[PDB]
Design a protein around this ligand. Structure first.
Ligand code: CN3
Ligand code: CN3
Ligand code: 8PE
Ligand code: 8PE
Ligand code: HEM
Ligand code: HEM
Ligand code: HEM
Ligand code: HEM
Ligand code: UQ6
Ligand code: UQ6
Ligand code: 9PE
Ligand code: 9PE
Ligand code: AZO
Ligand code: AZO
Lengths: 62, 54, 126, 385, 93, 385, 126
């Protein structure tokens, strides 16, 4: 048939599009992921770095 | 609008996920430690020392 | 790896035997229906691996109206696979449409490559 | 053009993980290769930080690991992530190779990619053997005694390869010191083979689960398969964290917390779980020279698969007989691992000999016969004659 | 540098497939679609047929190997008990 | 085509050492880069074989090296080739960098190639510092005491970087064990930077001693520069063999055959010869914080040369004033090495302060002023006005 | 790095001064003879580094009979350098042949790039 006729997309479309609500919820979930990934990567580096400080038997002879 | 005050300006979208994660560390560690010690009350050394004072 | 000349030699021997075509041909019809490529809208000649010089020769010599229809069936099968669905039942390939359209072009290119190989490594006698 | 395509170092990054064309229909089995890259980084980084506190003398090796567990700040986290991380490395590698068998990824034009992967698998086995020796527990000493004594059955050179491997007359102090130095080196050779592995993959691209060409519908890597990779990265880290913090000694042997004693033999000498099927193949040949040859042939028989597969179709998706015998081979591999942890007793001796035959008959007998039959059934079910 | 050898994949614009003509495609932005419309109509019927049209290729080889291991484990348990002492000298010959 | 051009791994070999177009007029100074690749292989291979016999505990480190010299078969050959090979590595690297200064190899379009080379030079200095600590001689202990105490003058973080570098309160047993583990690792990072160094060179090719374009007359690498490379490889090995077998302790200090004693200070604390000019720059600043900043600025000032050279001609071949001040800079570097081996006495204190000023004034004052004057003298000597 | 517009501005100021052209011009003649590029058969404009967009523009606009002669002088200088010799004395460049043939093409391309840069970063006023 004619290429100007668009097929049926109605079982996935929102009843009201409302562009300032669809963008706001998607950016909440991406922002929460970057929040938790930065706090997780920070404690990971501090676990490896603090293993080079003085051990428990060295501190006992201080 | 609350997209453009929270997630548009990506001089602090990198920033707020880097500063909200700083205060996140102390509130999270205080809440779990308080729950973990209350679940195990009567078994810790501080609960033992309070009545091995004799 | 096994050539289509060898597959057609074994297969035509079974189909001419009246006792072997009563045993193997019912088993082959159950094997194809359990394979399930027709429920994705494919013919069998769409499934042949093409990364070899014989298959590249046969795909060049295919007429262009059949080459456009082969490209649509492959694209539609990739989209159905990523959605983890099957096609609607009125869009399945029927058995009378599952014909070997590419097989005569493959067998012609195989016979020409065999004749060239025999003439290149050849003996003479006085 | 953009700077990610014009710079000399960023164009290698852009053509590999940003703009590389992927087939649109690959599933979650195609995520195992990037998990193996994360596992290799985890094993290398926890390895360096533990090596700052380790002593490789035979009088000091067991107490150095106990010093890491007790006195180093977060030292028990470094060891438990390292020991459990080696078991997770082998599990992801087994699933990655079994994906290649099922979908026909070994076939042309990807034979060089499959051959480099077999070299990587051999070097990973040798790495885990050398790190287990460095603990010098009771299972460390006697497992090294059994394996190194196999090489003395080689004709005319055998009794001099073993004493060159010992540095002496038995497993002793020069053996442990040279095994720790080799254990540092081989993960850097593995990292160079991974770079050669990714170069051969860039030439032809990946296959897809339908077995047919992917050149008609491609999507770029960035933000589609980057975010699909994040789902399996976080699931991998969660399951690994449950083992490191809540059950850290489930995948090990309690005899390795006894220090190594060359005068007391343990009641049972058992390897780690990921080397148990190759241990049962070795114990099923009574002659000692043919047993060590068959043990190394179980890895090298993976190279015959591009020549014994006779099918004109790539993969197992539309083949019902090849599907059945693939899962026969999978549960045969699990049974061989269970036999390798039992005593040498009736009826486990005959069961291991039948399962050893089924392993080698899959590559050399079953695959060329079944794929020839499936070629003919596709033909005569369509051709009117 | 020198030109490379002949492969079976190209790059964007010259990917190396057949020529396409007559196919139209349509798509809608993800910002204009319903958020997360899957757990139902996919756990209802879709995530049952996707493995139970495949379950018989896995569970027939699994039942063969589980029957074989369980039968051999009960025979080893009989041989090292008191009642299986007489058979034990016979089969260790 | 031929198989050396169609294979995925051999085409990298063919485009680098077989078919790569070289300018026809390069001289023997362009052979130093391939000698540096041979030196890195020699240091890595002798390093692994010695590490099979080495113990890194502070009670065992000095006697382990004496055990290598006496009890290991050909063990004195392994150590003497390793220690003297480090001095030959620095001498070839100094001549390689001085070739780049003279011929203008740092200029555009080769700025990325020059910047990667400066990173390699920093990592090589850090490598040789860590290997000298592993001997634990008397010069090993007190040289590590002097250098690690410099970092405590950094504001607000200084007293906690040093104790994180010691693992304790001074140079002690955790310091030597972590320095040997870092010494194993950094040569593998150097090998990865060398690969990035060769990728940037393949993009533009080499320069030539005339300073002008080489695109008009090229000859391939194989059998012309392969056989020219063999002349300098055999001369290098002959001079290195004369030091290893006939004079093996000339380039070292006899105080390093005394075991490390933290209670007895030596009469003079002197580094190896290739670190002596940077030691004299540090001792010429009386304030302790500005002295360690100036010491690290002496390496980082090499990065300003693409911006301070103002000439429209590449190289020093046709410039008589730039030739004169290049050799002023070379003999100033030799004098700074000689001052670094003297006591802090009159008049060596003022001589080291003037020579430190001449080092930094070459890059920032002399090169932009002289190259501006030579631009104008070329113009007015030809133009009729 | 220093532009040829800046070099010509300083150099033409010296050549118009009658007291500065008596001091610097004898020093510049000794500087060129000690440089020695004329004994290899080169002019000075052969020595200018060319790996920049201004010099690639000026080399495209050179007439083709001068472009063929420039290519021969560069090739002859590379062959003389690898033999560690000098040219015969009757093949040296004379001072009346060492003319700036490329300088007017360079100065024209520099002025056009400066005018484009001033129009691209520009202010207005009402
Ligand atoms: C060991 C430590 C490593 C940890 C990580 C390794 C993960 C290995 C898992 C094996 C694998 O990679 O293949 C998985 C395969 C499914 O592939 P498929 O693309 O056809 O399914 C897409 C789906 O329909 C949509 O999946 P969708 O993308 O829509 O949602 C994601 C889903 C979780 O996805 C994953 O975690 C993938 C592992 O989220 C939810 O379930 C929502 C409710 C919470 O599954 C199968 O083919 C058969 C299922 C059983 C396989 C288990 C065999 C293990 C030996
Ligand atoms: C730690 C030490 C490791 C030692 C390992 C070897 C390292 C050598 C380092 C010295 C060096 O870098 O030499 C470079 C320098 C090149 O600079 P240049 O441009 O002035 O001279 C072009 C080429 O030499 C002509 O040398 P020529 O080409 O004339 O030699 C003839 C022949 C090659 O002969 C030889 O093999 C002798 C070695 O080649 C032919 O022409 C015949 C072919 C038919 O050579 C020179 O001739 C200049 C002399 C100054 C050297 C002083 C070094 C100060 C440190
Ligand atoms: C020398 C080295 C030898 C290596 C041998 C490796 C053996 C280790 C065992 C690894 C198990 C991995 C088996 C699965 C391999 C993945 C490839 C595969 O089988 O495809 C997935 C399969 C196909 O499903 P579909 O039909 O929906 O997709 C078709 C494409 N359109 O969908 C499925 O059927 C998935 C079902 C998976 C069940 C497998 C159970 C495995 C149990 C092992 C337990 C081991 C610990 C005890
Ligand atoms: C972090 C900062 C690092 C600083 C790095 C500086 C390192 C300096 C250490 C010494 C390096 C040795 C300098 C070698 C000079 C290399 C320069 C070069 O590549 O060639 C220059 C020159 C070219 O001469 P031509 O062949 O072009 O002559 C033809 C007629 N025009 O060739 C020549 O004229 C060669 C003349 C011989 C030079 C003698 C130098 C003496 C060096 C004394 C070393 C003392 C060590 C104890
Ligand atoms: C692919 C990489 C690696 C693998 C598969 C691997 C595997 C292993 C294994 C299985 C053990 C025995 C663990 C136990 O049961 O206690 C071990 C121990 C050890 N490995 Fe590794 N390793 C790897 C990389 C490294 C590297 C690169 C280093 C050092 C730089 C290192 C240092 C150590 C040390 C010090 C031990 C002894 C401490 C311990 O027992 O945990 N490892 N390794
Ligand atoms: C440290 C080890 C390894 C790493 C990091 C690695 C990495 C990868 C990656 C990232 C891919 C592409 C994505 C994918 O298909 O998953 C891939 C593909 C592949 N790998 Fe590996 N791999 C490793 C080991 C192996 C081994 C042991 C084998 C086989 C014996 C192997 C054989 C293959 C094959 C055949 C493919 C192509 C699959 C296809 O295109 O369908 N690799 N590898
Ligand atoms: C670019 C590479 C290297 C450089 C420049 C270098 C440099 C040095 C130096 C200067 C010393 C002190 C030697 C002395 O005066 O006695 C040393 C010692 C040592 N190095 Fe290296 N090294 C390198 C690579 C390696 C590697 C890769 C290893 C180990 C795998 C290694 C292992 C050792 C050992 C065991 C010692 C102590 C034995 C001795 O004193 O000779 N080195 N190194
Ligand atoms: C392990 C260290 C190094 C290795 C293996 C190495 C290797 C090489 C090689 C093989 C070449 C080409 C041939 C030649 O011109 O000699 C080269 C060129 C070059 N290298 Fe290195 N190099 C190293 C260190 C350095 C350092 C420390 C610098 C400078 C700070 C540097 C700067 C350069 C430059 C500028 C060139 C281009 C020279 C020209 O084209 O005229 N490299 N290098
Ligand atoms: C201008 O044009 C040129 C050019 O003129 C030249 C000469 C070269 C070639 C010069 C080079 C220096 C390239 C070669 C590079 C190296 C030699 C660097 C070394 C690289 C490494 C990765 C080092 C690692 C090597 C090893 C051998 C370590 C492994 C050690 C082992 C296996 C021993 C341990 C084993 C046991 C059993 C203990 C060019 O590449 C080039 O560019 C196109
Ligand atoms: C088909 O399309 C694909 C594709 O699907 C995928 C998944 C990838 C995925 C790519 C990968 C998974 C990359 C592979 C992973 C590696 C190569 C990892 C290599 C490992 C290393 C480099 C280890 C190095 C580690 C260190 C140097 C850490 C050292 C420790 C230190 C320095 C301690 C610090 C010391 C002190 C004193 C603080 C592709 O590239 C790709 O394109 C082809
Ligand atoms: C041994 C395996 C080797 C594998 C190589 C993989 C590549 C790893 C690189 C990873 C990304 C690194 C980003 C580099 C940043 C951009 C490059 C750049 O800035 O180059 C230059 C500046 O030069 C430098 O300072 C180089 C910095 C050294 C980088 C060492 C890590 C950018 O300027 P330029 O205009 O020349 O870029 C175009 C180049 N064709
Ligand atoms: C980025 C820096 C790292 C890169 C290093 C590059 C240098 C690597 C080593 C080069 C040495 C050459 C190795 C042999 C080359 C022949 C390979 C071959 O014949 O290809 C295969 C055989 O497959 C293999 O078994 C490869 C084993 C690799 C072993 C390397 C350890 C057949 O050749 P093919 O027909 O595929 O050639 C076309 C390639 N596109
Ligand atoms: C040092 O002992 C190592 C062991 C281990 O499991 O390391 C991870 C081990 C312990 C007890 C008994 C044996 C052990 O080692 C091994 C080693 C091993 O090596 C091979 C694996 C596949 C093919 C060939 C070999 C060999 N040799 N196959 C089986 N067990
Ligand atoms: C462990 O002692 C190492 C020494 C050595 O020479 O190693 C090869 C050494 C011995 C005595 C005195 C000092 C020593 O070390 C050093 C270290 C050193 O390091 C640098 C070099 C250049 C720029 C910055 C630094 C620093 N820090 N510069 C000079 N001497």
């Amino acid at each position: 048939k004619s290429t100007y006729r668009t097929p049926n997309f109605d079982d996935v479309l929102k009843e009201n599009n409302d562009a300032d609500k669809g963008r706001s919820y998607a950016y909440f979930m991406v922002g929460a992921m970057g929040l938790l990934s930065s706090a997780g990567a920070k404690s990971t580096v501090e676990t490896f770095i603090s293993s080079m400080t003085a051990t428990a038997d060295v501190l006992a002879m201080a | 609008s609350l997209y453009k005050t929270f997630f548009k300006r990506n001089a602090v979208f990198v920033g707020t996920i880097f500063a909200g994660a700083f205060v996140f560390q102390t509130v999270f560690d205080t809440a779990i430690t308080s729950w973990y010690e209350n679940h195990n009350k009567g078994k810790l050394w501080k609960d033992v020392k309070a009545r091995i004072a004799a | 790896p096994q050539s289509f000349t060898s597959i057609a030699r074994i297969g035509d021997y079974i189909l001419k035997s009246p006792v072997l075509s009563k045993l193997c041909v019912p088993v082959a019809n159950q094997f194809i229906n359990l394979a399930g490529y027709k429920k994705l809208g494919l013919k069998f000649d769409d499934l042949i691996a093409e990364e070899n010089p014989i298959m590249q020769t046969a795909l060049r010599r295919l007429p262009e109206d059949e080459s456009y229809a082969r490209a649509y069936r492959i694209i539609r099968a990739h989209q159905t696979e990523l959605t983890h669905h099957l096609l609607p039942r009125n869009e399945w390939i029927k058995a009378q449409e599952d014909v070997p359209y590419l097989l005569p072009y493959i067998l012609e290119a195989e016979a020409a490559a065999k004749e060239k190989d025999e003439l290149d490594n050849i003996e003479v006698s006085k | 053009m953009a700077f990610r395509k014009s710079n000399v170092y960023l164009s290698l990054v852009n053509s590999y993980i940003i703009d590389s064309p992927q087939p649109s229909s690959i599933n979650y089995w195609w995520n195992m290769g990037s998990l193996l890259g994360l596992c290799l980084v985890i094993q290398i980084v926890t390895g360096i930080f533990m090596a700052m506190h380790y002593s490789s003398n035979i009088e000091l090796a067991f107490s150095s690991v106990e010093h890491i567990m007790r006195d180093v700040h977060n030292g028990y986290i470094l060891r438990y992530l390292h020991a459990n991380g080696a078991s997770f490395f082998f599990m992801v590698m087994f699933m990655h190779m079994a994906k290649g068998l099922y979908y026909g990824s070994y076939r042309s034009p990807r034979v060089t990619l499959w051959n480099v992967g077999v070299i990587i698998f051999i070097l990973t086995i040798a790495t885990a053997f050398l790190g287990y020796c460095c603990v010098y527990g009771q299972m460390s000493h006697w497992g090294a005694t059994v394996i190194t004594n196999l090489f003395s059955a080689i004709p005319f050179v055998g009794n001099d390869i073993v004493s060159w491997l010992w540095g002496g007359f038995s497993v002793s102090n020069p053996t442990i010191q040279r095994f720790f130095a080799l254990h540092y080196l081989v993960p850097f050779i593995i990292a160079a083979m991974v770079i050669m592995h990714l170069m051969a993959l860039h030439i032809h691209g990946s296959s897809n689960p339908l077995g047919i060409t992917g050149n008609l519908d491609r999507i770029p890597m960035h933000s589609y398969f980057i975010f699909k990779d994040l789902v399996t990265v976080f699931l991998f880290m969660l399951i690994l964290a449950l083992f490191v913090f809540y059950s850290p000694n489930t995948l090990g042997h309690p005899d390795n917390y006894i220090p190594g004693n060359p005068l007391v033999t343990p009641a049972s000498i058992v390897p780690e779980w990921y080397l148990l099927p190759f241990y049962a193949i070795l114990r099923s040949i009574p002659d000692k020279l043919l047993g060590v040859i068959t043990m190394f042939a179980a890895i090298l028989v993976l190279l015959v698969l591009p020549f014994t597969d006779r099918s004109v179709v790539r993969g197992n998706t539309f083949k019902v007989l090849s599907k059945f015998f693939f899962f026969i081979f999978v549960f045969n591999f699990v049974l061989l691992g269970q036999i390798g942890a039992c005593h040498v007793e009736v009826p486990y001796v005959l069961m291991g000999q039948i399962a050893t035959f089924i392993y080698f008959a899959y590559f050399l007998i079953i695959v060329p016969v079944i794929s020839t039959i499936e070629n003919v059934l596709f033909y005569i079910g369509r051709v009117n004659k | 540098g020198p030109p490379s050898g002949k492969t079976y994949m190209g790059w964007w614009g010259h990917m190396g497939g057949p020529k396409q003509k007559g196919i139209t495609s349509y798509a809608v932005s993800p910002y204009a679609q319903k958020p997360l419309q899957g757990i139902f109509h996919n756990a209802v019927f879709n995530s049952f047929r996707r493995f139970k049209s495949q379950f018989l290729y896995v569970l027939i080889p699994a039942g063969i190997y589980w029957y074989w291991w369980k039968n051999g484990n009960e025979y080893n348990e009989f041989l090292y008990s008191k009642a299986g002492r007489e058979e034990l000298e016979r089969v260790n010959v």
